[PDB]
């Protein structure tokens, strides 16, 4: 069910990421650096466990989870959140909750590209990733 998401992916387009980061309270200097960063995202499975790595010079993250089972997460911007990742409509939907707030990270495949839609508050960011061979 998750298999077309698996592999190594490179950021090739970003829309409204500054809006999204600002909504989360990320400071201006961090937003500068992030606006010029192109992460690599690696999604792997081993049985029922998925591991999602996000790699960049000034920040790396890694999470492991089972679909549909809540996990604790500490995000790149140091929020301590309660997370769950599920498939919905063929999309990989990651929901983070903290302090009564929520954000969603939705991944879908369109024409072989991985489209990541990030929503917090009213801010909606769309990041496009291309698969590495
Ligand atoms: C690893 C996060 C994405 C790249 C960040 C580059 C800038 C690093 C500079 C300082 C460290 C703190 C950065 C925090 C940035 C905002 C994070 C917001 C939540 C995660 C967004 C993931 C986006 C993606 O998956 O494409």
From Swiss-Prot:
Keywords linked to the UniProt accession: Acetylation, Cytoplasm, Lipid-binding, Phosphoprotein, Transport
Gene Ontology CC: cytosol; extracellular exosome; extracellular space; nucleus; sarcoplasm
Sites bearing Phosphotyrosine, chain numbering: 20
Binding site for hexadecanoate: 127-129
Family annotation (Pfam families): Lipocalin
Residue numbers carrying Phosphoserine: 23, 83
Main location: cytoplasm
Domain of life: Eukaryota
Molecular function per GO: cytoskeletal protein binding; icosatetraenoic acid binding; long-chain fatty acid binding; long-chain fatty acid transmembrane transporter activity; oleic acid binding
Location(s) in or outside the cell: Cytoplasm
Membrane-spanning parts: none
Modified residues (N-acetylvaline): 2
Residues reported in the UniProt entry to bind octadecanoate: 127-129
Binding site for (9Z)-octadecenoate: 127-129
Any single GO BP term: regulation of fatty acid oxidation
Residues carrying Phosphothreonine: 8, 30
UniProt free text on domains: Forms a beta-barrel structure that accommodates the hydrophobic ligand in its interior.
Function: FABPs are thought to play a role in the intracellular transport of long-chain fatty acids and their acyl-CoA esters.
Sequence similarity: Belongs to the calycin superfamily. Fatty-acid binding protein (FABP) family.
PANTHER family from the UniProt entry: FATTY ACID BINDING PROTEIN (PTHR11955)
Record protein name field: Fatty acid-binding protein, heart
Taxonomy of the source species: Eukaryota, Metazoa, Chordata, Craniata, Vertebrata
Gene from which this protein is expressed: FABP3
């Amino acid at each position: 069910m998750v298999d077309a998401f698996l592999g190594t992916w490179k950021l090739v387009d970003s829309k409204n990421f500054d809006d999204y980061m600002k909504s989360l309270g990320v400071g201006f200097a961090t937003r500068q650096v992030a606006s010029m960063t192109k992460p690599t995202t690696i999604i792997e499975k081993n049985g029922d466990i998925l591991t999602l790595k996000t790699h960049s010079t000034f920040k790396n993250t890694e999470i492991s989870f089972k679909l549909g089972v809540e996990f604790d997460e500490t995000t790149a911007d140091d929020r301590k959140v309660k997370s769950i990742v599920t498939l919905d409509g063929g999309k990989l939907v990651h929901l983070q909750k903290w302090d009564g707030q929520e954000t969603t990270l939705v991944r879908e495949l369109i024409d072989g590209k991985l489209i990541l839609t990030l929503t917090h508050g009213t801010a909606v960011c769309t990041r496009t990733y291309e698969k590495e061979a």
